[PDB]
Symmetry: C8
Subunit: 139 residues, 8 copies
């Protein structure tokens, strides 16, 4: 909760909680705060955060998805896209920060393309992208 407003110290605490204390050192070197944590990628992990293991990256991204599914986005979500995504599918709430970081709100969702969701918003599952796109044009 209030992950978007997390500073570096909260990231260290969460990394210690989820079993990534070694990479807690690495993150503290790179000054990763809540915004950068919520907008992290595979390439950034590999090049900057010392995560050279694909399996360990998968476990970390599972834990990051778990954190994004239960985060509080009241600070950044004016249109309240979090419950919209959750109503679509409870596991779709993890895309809230990716959507709002693009400037997207509930109003302009109907003009969002699949390429935009893939690239600018960071939704990588084609099955998930289709369901979000389908509901977007429905409204």
């Amino acid at each position: 909760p209030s992950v978007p407003s997390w500073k570096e110290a909260e990231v260290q605490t969460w990394l210690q909680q989820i079993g990534f204390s070694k990479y807690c050192e690495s993150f503290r070197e790179q000054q990763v705060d809540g915004d950068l944590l919520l907008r992290l990628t595979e390439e950034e992990l590999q090049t900057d955060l010392g995560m050279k293991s694909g399996i360990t990256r998968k476990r970390f991204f599972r834990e990051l998805t778990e954190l994004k599914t239960f985060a509080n986005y009241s600070t950044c979500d004016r249109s309240n896209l979090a419950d919209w995504l959750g109503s679509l599918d409870p596991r779709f709430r993890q895309y809230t920060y990716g959507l709002v970081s693009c400037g997207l709100d509930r109003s302009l969702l109907h003009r969002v393309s699949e390429q935009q969701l893939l690239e600018d918003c960071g939704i990588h599952l084609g099955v998930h992208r289709a369901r979000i796109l389908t509901a977007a044009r429905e409204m």
Copy 2:
């Protein structure tokens, strides 16, 4: 059975059972649990798990397919896709975890594309993908 809920120790036991004790060490280094075992790939095997042999990877994937064909998915399969796939073909039950990990259930199967099955769900045989796709549009 209950492979989706396996921790690391069950993976070690299964690896010892199927003749991969050397790679049991390697898996224990990479902390592979049941979810990661069911969602394993060739690239992950090669880069992270020390399996540099294509023939040995083939034998391991045969044994993994055997395990996925007889696994219990009651924890993760709410729509019970396992018996649906088995009714399609008894050897199609191995794709249950790949399908449910995508968020797919019995309801949205008719909108699944072949590209989605190839990429997001991990079905690599084109013959198998066509039969699943054909039955999906039939219902």
Copy 3:
């Protein structure tokens, strides 16, 4: 005969018979049994089995084709595709294991594409693929 049920020792015996005792050592290192022998490729030979000679790979694949032409597939061929392929052409019987390993039987042959035969079933001769495809749509 009963090549699909061959263990490693039968592979060693056959390799000794066909003049590949040096590679009999290499195969025993890689634990190649009958299923892996029938599903072998050029890339697997080169990378895993020490066969760095293209000419020697050609001779080995001639001998493998001879073995596949006279193998007994009663264990794996429920629809009895072996005599169907032989009736098409006596040299087409070598593709029986490649076809049945895909889950294909006599019923679904009419929906098989040329891309599927090339990739999933391993038929590499375009002339052979066309004749199999032509007879498939005929029935």
Copy 4:
């Protein structure tokens, strides 16, 4: 404010303010003034300014976006595109210098293509590009 008219010293002061004193040295080596600061890229940062961290580049670009959102463009913006972009979206004001550096004003915005916005004007978010393009053809 008056970022477009900043010399090197103002860049050093801003870099010290935003937590980039080490890179303040690097910028002073490369003589980066306000125009070059407003027209900076990822490639220029990496090759010329010693910023080898993708995460640190992300933080720097967040701070650069914050500075561009509140800069005064009265010197270079004759048609006053800054308030036009702000009326479109308050976070769109950061593109003012990229647009005016191309010679664009309010008059010729309706002939601007998406490729032009991506390449010549430096707008990298596809979602942002679409909204600017949509409003451009509207007027």
Copy 5:
């Protein structure tokens, strides 16, 4: 004559006859018999047979074409494609083994594509391929 049934020793004798005694050693290392001689390629020559000279490969392929033009194919040519090709053009008789190795006979020639002749049958001259294809559809 009876080149398709040549063993290694006949290949050594022919290589000595045509001025390739050094490469006679190399061929004896690679166990090239009549079938492999008739189905030889540029890549196989370079990688396996020590023929690193393009000019020497050209001379060897001239001599191989001369041998294929006057070989006896009674053992392998049931439909007697040799005189058919010779009637088309006396220099077309060299393609008999390439055609029959594909399983092609006089009956199925009308369904043979140019891609098939280029790849599976090994006819590399586009002018020669067109003339064979033209006569194939004529009958």
Copy 6:
């Protein structure tokens, strides 16, 4: 003024004036006169003139654009394209030498393609190219 007729010494004087004395040495090594200065590129700068800095290349090209905007082209501009470009936009006068070096005059401007402007004339801004092309077809 009279930049097209500048010899090497005037280039040295201008380089000293604009803050590039180190590269004044480098230019004097490469014998860059006014014609070569007006027809300079990024690749030529990097490979021949020691300008390995992208930021420094940007500053140099700003100063080169300033010089081209106020140069006198009476020697080479028979059709007087300089005031035509200036009437289009005062910052378009920098393209005069690039246009006249191609042999272009006011008469044949209507047949000039965008590819020609990009490649032969050296106009790299797509926004600038479109405006020049639009006015070209207008007349």
Copy 7:
């Protein structure tokens, strides 16, 4: 004259005549006779004949074109394509050996494609290929 029947010694004599005695040694190493001389390429020259100079290759190909323009092809030209090509253009007689080596005669010239002339016959000038093709369809 009678270049198609030249052995190695005549090639040495011609090379000495045309100023390539050093490469006369190189050719004698590679056993280049008249047929190989008339069917020589740039790649063969570079890789096998020690001609690493593009300018020297150009001079050698000028001299080879001069020799091919005045060669006697009575041995190989049954349809007498040499005077046909000469009637088309006196400098087109150099393509006689390239055409006849493909099996082409005067009869089948009308079915020859531009791709065939470029690849199988070795005519590299597009202007020359068009004129030969145009006259081919005319007859």
Copy 8:
């Protein structure tokens, strides 16, 4: 004048005249005569003539263009394309040798394609190619 008939010594004299005495040595090593001088390229200069400077190559090609503009082509230009090109544009006379070396005369100019002018004739400016092509179809 009479550049097409220049031997090596005239090339040395011209190179000394135009300020390329160092490369006069290099040309004398490569035996560049008038025909090779008139048919020179960037790649040949770089690889064979030691001209590793792009700027120096540009100056040399300016001087070569000046020489080609005032050369006498009476020996090679039977149709007198030189005055035709000069009438098109006085700076188009430099393409005379490139055109006549292709076998082109005034008669077949109307069938010349832009690809042919770019590749076989060596006209590299798209603006120049279009004007030559336009006048070619006009006649």
